[PDB]
Amino acid sequence: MVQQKVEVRLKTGLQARPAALFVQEANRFTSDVFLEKDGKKVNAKSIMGLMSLAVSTGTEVTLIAQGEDEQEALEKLAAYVQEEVL
Amino acid sequence: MVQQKVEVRLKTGLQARPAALFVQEANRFTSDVFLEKDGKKVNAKSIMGLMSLAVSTGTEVTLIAQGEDEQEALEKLAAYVQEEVL
Numbered sequence: 001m002v003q004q005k006v007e008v009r010l011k012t013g014l015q016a017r018p019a020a021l022f023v024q025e026a027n028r029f030t031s032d033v034f035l036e037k038d039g040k041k042v043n044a045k046s047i048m049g050l051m052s053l054a055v056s057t058g059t060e061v062t063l064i065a066q067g068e069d070e071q072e073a074l075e076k077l078a079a080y081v082q083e084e085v086l
Numbered sequence: 087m088v089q090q091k092v093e094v095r096l097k098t099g100l101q102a103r104p105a106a107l108f109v110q111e112a113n114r115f116t117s118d119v120f121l122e123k124d125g126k127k128v129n130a131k132s133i134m135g136l137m138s139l140a141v142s143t144g145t146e147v148t149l150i151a152q153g154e155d156e157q158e159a160l161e162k163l164a165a166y167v168q169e170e171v172l
């Protein structure tokens with residue numbers, strides 16, 4: 001048995017569970033909802049789409065919403081992404 | 087439309103493709119391989135298992151290999167994880 005402490009340089013992204021819950025919430029709005037970082041934009045209403053964006057916990061990203069209920073969509077999803085409750 | 091910069095507090099892990107390619111590389115060896123971080127260990131020959139470890143790009147993890155070709159496996163996989171492939 002051999003072991004080695006290594007630095008992960010591979011790309012990371014939202015895990016499946018967190019992404020699924022994100023999508024479940026986003027789907028309740030008619031607005032298009034996207035997550036964006038460094039010129040890359042993914043659809044927040046799709047699990048695989050959300051997971052394709054390279055992100056790390058603690059990373060800053062841009063949440064975008066466009067539609068009739070964009071304000072509420074933004075408020076609810078921003079709270080979710082930042083794990084805020086009450 | 088509207089937007090807001092938010093901090094990702096959700097859990098992240100290796101993305102699907104890098105994880106799949108890691109496993110394809112690990113599959114070339116008979117040794118069992120694992121990844122460990124903060125008391126949690128996952129089977130590195132399982133894509134979903136590998137993706138379940140809470141990881142962010144740039145963080146440290148412990149790569150483990152055990153079997154007949156463990157030394158060779160560790161070196162190849164360590165290079166892959168740290169993006170130092172030859």
